């Protein structure tokens, strides 16, 4: 049960499942987008199990099970938060978001979620 005002700015495939550079290349190339700035404003829920990006005021428009998440972090630009998830069995995606108070608050929540999740599966 979370709450984060963030602008979903797309998802694209990435080479290796982790690394701050791999993440930045990804976030970076999603940022380099000269346009009318059409990133969808959303609201992120982060349960221990799932991450959801609902639209403002209506099922999700992007979601991801915390278990699939492999790497996370704030990019070279503190406004952005990116995350890589092992999707295609032997293949990785990367989603990014814009946050004005800054992406740290969100990031912390996502990490804490991954921690709980990981620990739940490690032992039984």
Q: What residue has token string 């406004």? A: 79
Which residue from 7, 8, 15 is spatially nearest to 86, judged by alpha carbons?
Answer: 15
**Per the structure block, which two tokens stand in for 36?**
């009318």
| 3-state secondary structure string across the chain | CCCCEEEEEEEEEECCCCCHHHHHHHHHHHHCCCCCCCCEEEEEEECCCEEEEEECCCCCCCEEEHHHEEEEEECCCCCEEEEEEECCCCCEEEEEEECCCCCHHHHHHHHHHHHHHHHHHHCC
- Count CA atoms within 13 Å of residue 69 on its CB side: 27
Beta strand pairing status for 69-74 and 63-65?
unpaired
Which structural domain range is residue 9 located in? 1-124
Method of structure determination:
X-ray
CATH number at residue 48: 2.30.29.30
Calpha distance 65→94 (Å, rounded): 13
The number of distinct structural domains making up the chain is 1
User: What is the side-by-side order of every strand in the sheet holding 80-86?
Assistant: 63-65, 50-55, 40-46, 5-14, 92-98, 80-86, 69-74
Beta carbons of 109 and 4 less than 8 angstroms apart: yes
Q: What are phi and psi of 46, to 5 degrees?
A: -130, 100
């Amino acid at each position: 049960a979370q709450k984060y005002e963030a602008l979903y700015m797309g998802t694209l495939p990435v080479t290796k499942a982790m690394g701050m550079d791999v993440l930045n290349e990804a976030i970076g190339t999603l940022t380099a987008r000269g346009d009318r700035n059409a990133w969808v404003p959303t609201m992120l829920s982060v349960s221990d199990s799932l991450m959801t990006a609902h639209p403002i005021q209506e099922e999700p428009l992007w979601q991801c099970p915390v278990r699939l998440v492999t790497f996370i972090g704030v990019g070279r630009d503190p406004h952005t938060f990116g995350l890589i998830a092992d999707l295609g069995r032997q293949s990785f995606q990367c989603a990014a978001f814009w946050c004005q108070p800054h992406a740290g608050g969100l990031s912390e929540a996502v990490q804490a979620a991954c921690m709980v999740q990981y620990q739940k599966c490690l032992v039984a």
